[PDB]
Amino acid sequence: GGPSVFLFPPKPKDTLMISRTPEVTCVVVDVSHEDPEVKFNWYVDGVEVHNAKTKPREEQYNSTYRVVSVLTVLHQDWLNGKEYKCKVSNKALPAPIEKTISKAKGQPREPQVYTLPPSRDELTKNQVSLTCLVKGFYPSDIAVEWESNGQPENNYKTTPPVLDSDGSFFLYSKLTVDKSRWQQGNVFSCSVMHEALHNHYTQKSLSLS
Amino acid sequence: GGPSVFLFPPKPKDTLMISRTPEVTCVVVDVSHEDPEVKFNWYVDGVEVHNAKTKPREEQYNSTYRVVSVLTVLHQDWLNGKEYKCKVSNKALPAPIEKTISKAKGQPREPQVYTLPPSRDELTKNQVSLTCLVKGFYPSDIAVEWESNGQPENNYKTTPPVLDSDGSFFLYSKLTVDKSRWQQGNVFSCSVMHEALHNHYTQKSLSLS
Ligand SMILES: *[C@@H]1O[C@H](CO)[C@@H](O[C@@H]2O[C@H](CO)[C@@H](O[C@H]3O[C@H](CO[C@H]4O[C@H](CO)[C@@H](O)[C@H](O)[C@@H]4O[C@@H]4O[C@H](CO)[C@@H](O[C@@H]5O[C@H](CO)[C@H](O)[C@H](O)[C@H]5O)[C@H](O)[C@H]4NC(C)=O)[C@@H](O)[C@H](O[C@H]4O[C@H](CO)[C@@H](O)[C@H](O)[C@@H]4O[C@@H]4O[C@H](CO)[C@@H](O)[C@H](O)[C@H]4NC(C)=O)[C@@H]3O)[C@H](O)[C@H]2NC(C)=O)[C@H](O)[C@H]1NC(C)=O
Ligand SMILES: *[C@@H]1O[C@H](CO)[C@@H](O[C@@H]2O[C@H](CO)[C@@H](O[C@H]3O[C@H](CO[C@H]4O[C@H](CO)[C@@H](O)[C@H](O)[C@@H]4O[C@@H]4O[C@H](CO)[C@@H](O[C@@H]5O[C@H](CO)[C@H](O)[C@H](O)[C@H]5O)[C@H](O)[C@H]4NC(C)=O)[C@@H](O)[C@H](O[C@H]4O[C@H](CO)[C@@H](O)[C@H](O)[C@@H]4O[C@@H]4O[C@H](CO)[C@@H](O)[C@H](O)[C@H]4NC(C)=O)[C@@H]3O)[C@H](O)[C@H]2NC(C)=O)[C@H](O)[C@H]1NC(C)=O
Ligand SMILES: [Zn+2]
Ligand SMILES: [Zn+2]
Ligand SMILES: [Zn+2]
Ligand SMILES: [Zn+2]
Ligand SMILES: [Zn+2]
Ligand SMILES: [Zn+2]
Question: Which molecular-function annotation in GO is an example for this chain (chains A, B)?
């Protein structure tokens, strides 16, 4: 074994928001010193493209260097399932290394988003859990955040998506707030980004009552 | 590199129910043919024990054999944090291989278990999601199942435990049932096994209203 290549997708939020810039990232590790230069070729559905920015080669505390090539991806292209290929070439190895990536494939399914208020019993306490159920979505790439009366409520945690029995995915997000805010009647909103939603975004709000 | 050892815990439910028999499992892989015999020593907190059942050595479709040693563990011992050691000895390697395992460590915290009924909107549908929140537990080993009017309802899925902001864990379980059963008023119960509960078991029931 010589050098290795790893091809990384963009982050899901970058793919879902037009104002962001998704990019895909090809990385080669275990490049030697004696035969140490390397060329990256990039293709989008088999046709070569030339706008990748490759980063200053850089040495590891082990015997190797590493070099990253970053390719900007169009919102459309990525969500339309275009395939991205990184070809890496070295004298140090027999044939160039070939990696491909695209968005998770499969018919898309829109999430159903449901907010659930605290249980009776939890209203014995100093804090309460506000719950967002997101289910029936496909593919599993998704983002969830909470907001109130405008601003983001950063005391929440979200489970990973769980494959459901029908082949779609669900998850839950749990927002914790002082029981006061809840009874003061404040408005909390669970907001969800996923490719199959209209404009890849939806929100559901929750309020005492 | 020669042979490798892997030491596996019991299953959480086996540890939590007295009627079950938890056992821990030591496995050696990449045993050679030329120097191929092996001895297992087992210790519970540093003192040797002699009741492990070691299995018929067995050959791999690659160049190696594999041999498993299984040690029965007492309910108490495992939940009281006793440490289990598998020592594996071979001529094929310099010194014997040493592996230790015990229950996840850390002060235990009892789960709070809360059932949440369907959202308004979900009651537009042919099916409804019944929700069990389990939170504040430690360590993360846990089991959840649903039952109704006696029997187990096997159309449910449970998220993995998620580390929460206070260092405890939570999860959600989602049971789906025909909207009818729900309105027919049936009784559904979320049941939870975890070491910090009284008798390692608790249940919470859910019913229309
Ligand atoms: C000398 O030292 C070097 C260290 O400098 C050694 O290099 C390391 O070698 C390993 C050899 O395996 C490398 O591979 C492992 O790593 C990847 C995952 O790496 C990421 O995460 C780790 C942190 O855990 C980081 O160290 C890396 O930097 C990576 O971080 C991500 O970087 C990305 C690039 O920037 C980020 O993506 C971008 O993020 C941007 C954010 O600013 C932006 O969002 C962009 O849009 C986005 O593109 C990403 O965010 C970073 N994430 C984090 C959290 O930081 C791992 O995938 C490799 O595993 C796969 O391969 C093995 C091969 O058999 C599998 O067994 C393994 O399970 C796994 O998956 C398998 O692979 C195939 C596909 O190849 C699957 O189809 C299989 O199904 C699957 N197997 C199974 C069972 O399912 C691997 O674990 C390691 O990354 C190297 N380190 C670095 C820094 O590169 C070198 O080895 C040393 N040499 C010697 C001789 O010892
Ligand atoms: C020749 O062929 C053989 C195949 O026959 C090759 O052997 C394989 O070699 C691998 C070398 O790594 C082995 O290790 C991997 O496997 C374990 C996990 O194995 C389990 O799961 C897989 C399925 O994915 C099965 O194949 C195994 O059988 C194991 O299944 C479990 O068996 C247990 C024993 O029965 C079960 O437990 C019992 O279950 C009972 C149920 O009846 C009962 O409940 C008992 O109570 C209970 O005890 C269990 O249920 C079975 N589960 C399932 C789902 O079936 C894996 O852990 C190894 O990974 C660790 O080690 C590497 C080392 O670096 C890590 O990088 C890796 O991440 C991982 O964790 C790391 O390790 C350390 C601790 O060592 C951690 O502290 C680190 O932090 C951690 N790393 C990180 C990043 O966090 C590894 O993946 C593989 O198991 C072998 N197969 C078999 C069958 O043994 C052999 O290699 C070949 N030879 C050559 C030369 O090629
Ligand atoms: Zn070019
Ligand atoms: Zn639309
Ligand atoms: Zn779009
Ligand atoms: Zn003995
Ligand atoms: Zn008690
Ligand atoms: Zn007990």
Answer: immunoglobulin receptor binding
Q: How was this structure determined?
A: X-ray
Of the residues B87, B102, B117, the one at which a domain ends:
B102
Amino acid code (one letter) for A62: N
User: Are both B158 and B110 inside the same structural domain?
Assistant: yes
Give the C-alpha separation, A80 to A74, whole Å: 10
A23 Cβ inside 6 Å of ligand 1 = yes
Structural domain for B84, as ranges: 3-102
Residues of B in contact with A118 (CB under 8 A): 114
- Same domain as B153, residue B70: no
| Residue B202 main-chain phi, psi, to 5 deg | -150, 160
Q: Which two tokens stand for residue B166?
A: 């206070």
The C-alpha atoms of residue B145 and residue B189 are separated, in whole angstroms, by: 8
Q: Give me the CATH number covering residue B59.
A: 2.60.40.10
Q: Is B6 in the pocket of ligand 2 (CB under 6 A)?
A: yes
Question: Which candidate from A114, A121, A176 shows the least CB-CB separation from B114?
Answer: A121
Breaks (C-N over 2.5 A) in chain A follow: none
Q: In chain A, where do the E strands start and end?
A: 4-8, 23-31, 39-44, 47-49, 53-54, 58-59, 65-72, 84-89, 97-101, 112-116, 127-137, 143-148, 151-152, 156-158, 162-163, 169-178, 188-193, 201-206
Question: Total structural domains in chain A?
Answer: 2
CA of A73 to the centre of ligand 5 (A): 13
* Co-location of B83 and B109 in the same domain: no
On whether both B13 and B52 belong to a single domain, the answer is yes
Please enumerate in sequence order all residues whose Cβ is within 8 A of that of B110, keeping only pairs 6 or more positions apart, or say none.
B136, B137, B194, B196, B197
